[PDB]
Structure formats: structure tokens, C-alpha cells
Design a protein around this nucleic acid. Structure first.
Length: 49
RNA sequence: UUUAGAAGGAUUGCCGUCAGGAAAUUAGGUGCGCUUAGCAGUGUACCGCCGGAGGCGG
């Protein structure tokens, strides 16, 4: 009853085990969900008040 | 200088059938309404008169 999110911050093998049988690249995926870029305000348009 | 500036919600329709509210009753005792006044105000205006509309006599 926990979310992939909470397990990917601690890396409990509960996932460690389950992913590695179903894929070959859990290492690359976890680094891209744990260091995510932030949204930046860069421009405006006619649809923003 | 406004969470700025813009907008067609539309068309159609069978709610129905039945029925026992019912029985009993104690509202009762008492009681100070009350001292003053002018229907007045003026109590209403009448006949005329020429004129033709407009103006004085009793």
C-alpha cells in the first residue's frame, strides 16, 4: 500500500527485485525520477492573463 | 488601463390501481373606573342691473 514514489526514495529492494526481472535499465530510470528539473517561467502569451 | 479581450444548449414525451382512526374525561376561587367642560367660528351670501361679453343699485 505504498506508492512507487516512496519506494524510489529509499530503494527498498521490494522494488529493486521486481523491476530487475522485468527490465534491464532500472538504474537509468531511477536517476531520472529522483533528480527532476524544475519548471521555469520564460515567456508569456495571449492565453495567460 | 479591472484572472484583460470572445461565446445560440437544443429537439420528444400517458404516473397509476386499492383502502374503517378509535375509545375516556370537573377549569376553578377574588375584586371601587373617574374627577372637568359654553357648537363655536360668520353660518353663508338675495334679487336685479345693464350690457352682450364686461360693470353699479337696493
Amino acid at each position: 500500500g505504498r506508492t512507487v514514489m516512496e519506494h524510489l526514495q529509499e530503494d527498498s529492494a521490494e522494488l529493486r527485485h521486481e523491476m530487475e526481472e522485468l527490465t534491464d535499465k532500472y538504474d537509468e530510470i531511477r536517476d531520472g525520477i529522483l533528480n527532476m528539473p524544475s519548471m521555469q517561467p520564460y515567456r508569456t502569451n495571449q492565453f495567460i492573463k
